[PDB]
Amino acid sequence: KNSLALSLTADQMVSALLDAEPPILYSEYDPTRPFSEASMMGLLTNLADRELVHMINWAKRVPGFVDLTLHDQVHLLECAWLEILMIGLVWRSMEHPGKLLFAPNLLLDRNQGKCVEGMVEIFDMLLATSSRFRMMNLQGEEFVCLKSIILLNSGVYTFLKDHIHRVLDKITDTLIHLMAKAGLTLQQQHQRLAQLLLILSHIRHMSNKGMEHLYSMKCKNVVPLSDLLLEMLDAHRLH
Amino acid sequence: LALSLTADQMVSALLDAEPPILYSEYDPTRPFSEASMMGLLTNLADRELVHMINWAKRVPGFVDLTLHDQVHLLECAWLEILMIGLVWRSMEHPGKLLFAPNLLLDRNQGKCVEGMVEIFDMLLATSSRFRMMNLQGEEFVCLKSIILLNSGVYTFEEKDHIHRVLDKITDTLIHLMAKAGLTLQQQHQRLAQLLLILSHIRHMSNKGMEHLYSMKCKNVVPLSDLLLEMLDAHR
Amino acid sequence: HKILHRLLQD
Amino acid sequence: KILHRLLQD
Ligand SMILES: C[C@]12CC[C@@H]3c4ccc(O)cc4CC[C@H]3[C@@H]1CCC2=O
Numbered sequence: 001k002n003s004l005a006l007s008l009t010a011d012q013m014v015s016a017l018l019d020a021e022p023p024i025l026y027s028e029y030d031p032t033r034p035f036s037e038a039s040m041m042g043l044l045t046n047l048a049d050r051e052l053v054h055m056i057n058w059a060k061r062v063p064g065f066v067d068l069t070l071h072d073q074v075h076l077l078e079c080a081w082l083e084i085l086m087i088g089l090v091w092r093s094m095e096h097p098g099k100l101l102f103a104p105n106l107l108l109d110r111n112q113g114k115c116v117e118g119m120v121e122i123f124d125m126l127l128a129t130s131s132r133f134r135m136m137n138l139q140g141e142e143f144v145c146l147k148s149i150i151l152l153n154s155g156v157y158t159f160l161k162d163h164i165h166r167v168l169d170k171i172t173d174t175l176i177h178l179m180a181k182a183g184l185t186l187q188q189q190h191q192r193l194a195q196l197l198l199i200l201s202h203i204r205h206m207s208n209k210g211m212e213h214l215y216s217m218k219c220k221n222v223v224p225l226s227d228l229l230l231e232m233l234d235a236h237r238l239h
Numbered sequence: 240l241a242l243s244l245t246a247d248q249m250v251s252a253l254l255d256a257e258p259p260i261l262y263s264e265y266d267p268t269r270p271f272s273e274a275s276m277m278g279l280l281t282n283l284a285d286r287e288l289v290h291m292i293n294w295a296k297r298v299p300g301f302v303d304l305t306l307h308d309q310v311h312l313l314e315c316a317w318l319e320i321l322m323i324g325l326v327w328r329s330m331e332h333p334g335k336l337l338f339a340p341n342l343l344l345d346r347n348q349g350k351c352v353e354g355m356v357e358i359f360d361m362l363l364a365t366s367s368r369f370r371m372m373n374l375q376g377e378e379f380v381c382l383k384s385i386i387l388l389n390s391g392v393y394t395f396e397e398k399d400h401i402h403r404v405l406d407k408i409t410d411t412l413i414h415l416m417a418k419a420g421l422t423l424q425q426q427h428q429r430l431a432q433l434l435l436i437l438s439h440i441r442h443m444s445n446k447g448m449e450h451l452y453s454m455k456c457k458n459v460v461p462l463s464d465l466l467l468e469m470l471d472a473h474r
Numbered sequence: 475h476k477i478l479h480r481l482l483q484d
Numbered sequence: 485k486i487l488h489r490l491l492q493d
């Protein structure tokens with residue numbers, strides 16, 4: 001009736017999150033023939049589908065997650081999957097100003113985004129988010145915490161329990177610890193925590209726009225979607 | 240002068256900028272239809288909207304921002320602000336939404352309108368959260384102000400000024416928690432717990448906007464041109 | 475000329 | 485549910 005996650009120290013939380021990191025995957029992107037709406041969507045959804053497989057492995061390695069029942073785990077992933085992909089992407093694109101690092105062999109800049117009408121405004125937000133992490137010096141230890149928050153948090157209020165909020169608190173505790181260790185003043189700690197948590201609101205926004213765009217692509221037969229992706233979309237419901 | 244106010248008078252100015260609780264022109268004599276209930280909601284919102292605009296003017300730091308920026312902020316935040324307002328005052332009416340003192344709608348009455356039950360459920364959930372944490376009106380007026388300032392800042396520098404005043408409200412939030420007797424770590428935990436609910440409020444707002452947009456194309460109810468300016472800034 | 479902008483000016 | 489399967493594999 002417990003969780004070995006609730007008695008982890010800060011350090012142990014950071015360690016277990018850093019090692020749980022998924023690998024960077026490559027795009028099967030063939031640079032010997034042009035970008036088209038279909039073909040870019042094809043490369044992106046393909047990459048999303050394979051990143052997905054690793055995301056699930058990773059989630060089972062977030063402290064306190066596998067303590068949830070499957071039906072909860074399912075709901076959380078279903079609910080967070082795109083936010084997680086997005087924040088990963090933004091992290092990878094940090095020290096590449098103006099560009100999105102979908103894969104080491106897939107750097108796309110805002111204008112490439114126009115290749116798929118309806119996409120460029122999502123690229124725009126993703127790039128805005130990259131600048132903000134960049135100019136606030138986001139660290140990897142903070143990144144992996146934010147990412148774990150999005151997982152446990154983004155689906156917790158549509159469970160219509162306290163153990164998920166217990167673990168969320170222990171991550172808050174870890175974030176502060178990291179800031180104090182980096183020598184931030186007490187009030188610099190609480191300011192920075194708020195600045196990081198406030199960005200999650202905007203990532204949530206991007207996810208909703210991204211979900212509606214992907215749905216549009218589907219309902220216009222621009223690209224096929226792996227049955228896995230199709231089930232992620234279906235968890236959400238669009239017009 | 241907004242960066243130089245004390246926590247106390249930050250709180251004071253916000254509690255004092257609060258909009259009035261408006262009434263619905265609902266007639267308890269003639270029963271609901273999809274179109275009457277929605278008409279009642281979008282009428283109510285058009286009115287709260289004009290109050291909101293004045294309240295925003297009285298959020299510290301707001302009129303420091305260019306008018307072009309003030310618009311963009313209100314355009315992104317407006318429904319989010321509406322929704323937190325609704326959740327706040329529905330807080331101790333478990334299972335219902337107090338849209339207006341004379342218009343408190345139970346989870347079932349959400350079905351009159353197609354697609355609304357879902358958004359209702361997320362609203363009541365959040366209201367069930369505020370009550371769970373026993374949110375306080377002083378914290379509330381901070382959340383609300385934070386939404387106004389945070390929601391549109393990344394889709395524009397005065398971004399800094401905005402972040403500077405956003406830090407002030409953060410400071411204010413913690414002041415309120417320290418004074419309430421919380422250990423340091425209970426402070427940073429509560430703060431985080433509140434800020435994470437803003438992501439859900441953002442979610443509800445994104446969902447509410449798509450539904451508002453579907454009721455509009457289907458022409459089931461007339462919106463005031465104010466509400467439509469607001470809507471159409473979102474796509 | 476958005477009615478919002480005019481409400482903000484007034 | 486492919487997700488359900490992947491979650492317990
Ligand atoms: C889902 C998506 C395609 C795939 C993108 C994608 C793909 C891989 C990845 O590591 C991150 C992202 C972030 C955004 C995703 C798009 C938003 C709208 C859309 O159609």
Ligand SMILES: C[C@]12CC[C@@H]3c4ccc(O)cc4CC[C@H]3[C@@H]1CCC2=O
Pocket residue numbers: 280281283284287318321322324325338358447448450451452454
């Ligand atoms: C905008 C809205 C009508 C007006 C509702 C409304 C109206 C007044 C109010 O104080 C709060 C709310 C919250 C939700 C709003 C609806 C969501 C979908 C829709 O069409």
